[PDB]
Design a protein around this ligand. Sequence first.
Ligand SMILES: CN1c2c(O)nc(N)nc2NC[C@@H]1CNc1ccc(C(=O)N[C@@H](CCC(=O)O)C(=O)O)cc1
Ligand SMILES: [K+]
Ligand SMILES: [K+]
Ligand code: NA
Length: 286
Amino acid sequence: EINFVNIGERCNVAGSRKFLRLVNEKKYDEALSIARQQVEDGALVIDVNMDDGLLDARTEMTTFLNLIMSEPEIARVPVMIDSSKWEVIEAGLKCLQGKSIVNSISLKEGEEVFLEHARIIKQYGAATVVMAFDEKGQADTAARKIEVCERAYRLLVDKVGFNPHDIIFDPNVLAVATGIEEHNNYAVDFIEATGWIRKNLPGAHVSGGVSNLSFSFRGNNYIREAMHAVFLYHAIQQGMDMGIVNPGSVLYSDIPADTLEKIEDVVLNRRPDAAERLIELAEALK
Ligand SMILES: CN1c2c(O)nc(N)nc2NC[C@@H]1CNc1ccc(C(=O)N[C@@H](CCC(=O)O)C(=O)O)cc1
Ligand SMILES: [K+]
Ligand SMILES: [K+]
Ligand code: NA
């Protein structure tokens, strides 16, 4: 965990009901405290996401980023500009004075669009997350994740002249234990793609949205945090070097052995009734 960058997840209106209310009510001082607390808890990057139908995302993004820059305790770490809308990202870039990180670009809309965005990002001197998503869809399997990332690396480095050290691949952290058997290997697929990327795509980082993994256990916060700790323990060993996380938790070492076995059975897909057994533990705890 010495070489792991924690990206604070909490300034995200779709990911935090509190953050959404604060922004909507214009309590920007309080919203900014959430950023500050994450920096105090070790976050070295702050993810900001204003995408909600109640909000003018672009304007909230520029307001919040400008406010961050006014607060030395927060402006000392980079901001990750998190939007599905390009106009929001570009407002964020124009707005920020220091290096920022785009979250994200992908091949979803085709190669010409990807290249155009990458070129704008490079002109701003920004780093970028690249989602493992191409013209064929979201990369779910390890093979798909590797296919999209290798192609994206090649395009970025060879056609855009993009600095490889400024590329952050997100091979997609997807929920497990969903009741759909086709999802059971999703953490293992991520971990496998992570290993390949760090061995084969020189200089590129690997990150992921860790909290998405545990979506099936909403309302069992211990189980979610235990899942996160287990996933990070195995992903970091393959070279995951960043992650979007709630930086405020449960340590891998502290998980009782029989509980660990159940969490690892799910995360590492070690038996087909793993989800069922973990759901049983989760019900007993609440
Ligand atoms: C989708 N995911 C993601 C990702 O996987 N990869 C990148 N690059 N960027 C992103 N950005 C958005 C997201 C990462 N951020 C997240 C992901 C999940 C949560 C989350 O689980 N929040 C809780 C609600 C917590 C609350 O409201 O108190 C939930 O149960 O929904 C909170 C923030
Ligand atoms: K919340
Ligand atoms: K969480
Ligand atoms: Na909106």
